[PDB]
Subunit: 243 residues, 4 copies
């Protein structure tokens, strides 16, 4: 049937997101646990904020590869919308994929508190937030262009020759995507902590649960979607890679 | 002959694990010796703990690439045992790898301290234990998922067609598997130093031998197996990508 | 139509360079803002200057991968000009890229300071200049070889068969080229911040505009060209791997 | 003719070695220039000794790829001997390849002094040396096993299907080799600064020119060759990958 594999192709998206978050989170939180804030431990010496940026782009690359020929290796709500606005994701999928992504991200970040809870709460919760020093418009713009780069990669990465089984869904070359994320994280983590993935953003937000988080949560949906839409427009028409 | 190509690989495992544990732990002890205790050493200016995580990751990347069409690139009881529940490595072929790998680790581990026994001993010796602040359940829960992440990555990394020499043992591109190892560490080192490898943990426990360390060791066997047995279960049925 | 697939790529260059300069410099300024001046910031605990070098490297890796079968993945006047002496990019097709790339950089550069004009200005703005202690000849000699390393890497990275859309423009795997960019930086950043990209340097010089910076800028054009013209010469004849 | 391409296949080995060294060197020296010794600059903050290890394994990977289908992508005297002892390098080549490698390495490190000369001399010269704290036997053993890993990769990396033009010389998969180097550098740089490449070792030695360097230069030829020989024995016979 069509309903059973679609369901299974969605089950993957949920699982991979769960893994992706908590690794990236417990990397961030593990970093923030080893690297001291004010006092009570060692300054620096952690994985560096280079190590954190490795966690995201690295876990993504792995999972995209793990979830390539199944779901399509989407793992990102912004990416899902891009591919959808590219008229190549069967509507109902995206609605489910977002539920899939946003579910597991809550789960993932949830498994992190359970482990520590102590050093979790004090240390950021791994939740995306505006860094003090920048205006909101600045932060919004970075998320837009940032996500744009990620999504621009995806479409370029789609090989028409190779496709997912029991579907017309584009399988993705797993490496440059995860590397594109890593580049963006290197560029962004100061400003916002790098959202460009509403699943992640909404994920830790539910768990960490802070006024400043919820107040600034509105960006990492708007910003990314704007970019993913722009990247779709940039790829399928003004580069016209459709034909 | 079945024995000559089998032992061909049963050794290749042992060697890789020897090489694996050697390069990795020699980095860790190196990192320790760079920052060290008050009087001697400078902080931060080592490889960074990221660099340690690199060592464990990339070594898996190359040793699998070398032992791909030979042993199948396990270098891990969990990965091997995981491929047994998956009914892809016949019983007797597993138990050998299980033992063959463990010895290499020890041989790899013991080789390291002979270089730096003075330093080695004072600085944790790359032994898998709980960092204080974490309840034992936290440490256990960390290993199972971390192993799962890898073993699942290992399974999605199974070519349906190509075999290692003279068996039904998988052969596929390793680069993701190395990252899975590398990734997990970055998030798991703060807790246990990242085990997700029963032989590696066992090999560290044998040489170092510290009671509080040695009686926590049970976790890094109990844990990883479950995470592997789950990933095998999930990938083979809950995804059922094996059905054809 | 010749114009529609040409401009198809003439834009793709411009955009990549815009994206390139944006992501890279936003990291640098980020690094600056993390350590900063006495009162504000913590040292070391940034990405590390290695992380900066990563940004320049990997961005070349992905933007070439995106613009491989489109523009041919130059994102660099030197690389483009280098492929002109190699007689592989017809005259008029180069001059466009030469200009098309430069604008993107500026557009990419200008976009960055609009985010952080306060910080940006106080912290070097990713502008290519000589760090004190180096004579100007040292800085020049650094850029030429660094560019050579890349442009030579670019040439050894030329598939004899596959073209970009509707031209005779090469298409081959990018991963080495990204590393060449990444590698050179690690050894060249201490001197100039690593130029090896005339458009990038020009783009940085336009927005930042500082006289002592702006009148040293001539180096990062004079240099890279020579290193590119050499690599093209060496690869095409001294190795003569192009002859068939 | 046979003499012209052989000569050209040797010209590549020289060039790539020149590049490899000075980049790795000026990375090491650039690191040591930015990172202070006792006083006169900033502590840490450099590329880290992770960044240095990236320079070696990274430059190698690039150049091996750049010099694959030509020379065979050898770049290392130890590797040359291994492939030779594997009965698959036409004797005369190795003698020339060593001259090729050891020449450019001197050149490379030479271009570094010219640039700085000031901060060159005080800061190690990028020359391999025993780290104070270890015995010589310890240091020798690391170079042996270290080089072994590098060379074991090479043979495993040799694809019999693909071969260099106008030769029977094995082209190498450029990535795992350069990555194997990187791993070893991460493991070794404390102890010796990682030799496993007599070209590099003899390269900076000529330029830096120190008593302690020349005294301890004897290791990074003996050690590596022992390993490269062992890796050859480990590969071609007790793994018997010859047939």
């Amino acid at each position: 049937l069509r309903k059973w594999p679609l369901y299974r192709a969605v089950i993957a998206e949920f699982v991979a997101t769960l893994l992706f978050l908590y690794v990236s989170i417990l990397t961030v939180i593990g970093y923030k646990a080893q690297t001291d804030a004010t006092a009570g431990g060692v300054d620096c010496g952690g994985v560096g904020i280079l190590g954190i940026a490795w966690a995201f782009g690295g876990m993504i690359f792995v999972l995209v590869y793990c979830t390539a020929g199944i779901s399509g290796g989407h793992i990102n709500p912004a990416v899902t919308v891009g591919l959808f606005l590219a008229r190549k994701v069967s509507l109902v999928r995206t609605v489910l994929y977002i539920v899939a992504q946003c579910l597991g991200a809550i789960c993932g970040c949830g498994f992190v508190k359970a482990f520590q809870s102590s050093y979790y709460t004090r240390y950021g919760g791994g939740a995306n937030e505006l860094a003090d020093g920048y205006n909101k418009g600045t932060g919004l713009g970075a998320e837009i262009i940032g996500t744009f780069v990620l999504v621009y990669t995806v479409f370029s990465a789609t090989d028409p020759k190779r496709n997912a089984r029991d579907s017309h869904v584009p399988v993705l070359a797993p490496l440059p995507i995860g590397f594109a994320v890593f580049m963006v994280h290197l560029a962004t983590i100061p400003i916002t902590g790098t959202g460009i993935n509403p699943a992640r953003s909404f994920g830790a937000a539910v768990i960490y649960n802070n006024e400043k988080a919820w107040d600034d949560q509105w960006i990492f949906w708007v910003g990314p979607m704007i970019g993913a839409a722009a990247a779709a427009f940039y790829h399928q028409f003004i580069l016209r890679a459709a034909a």
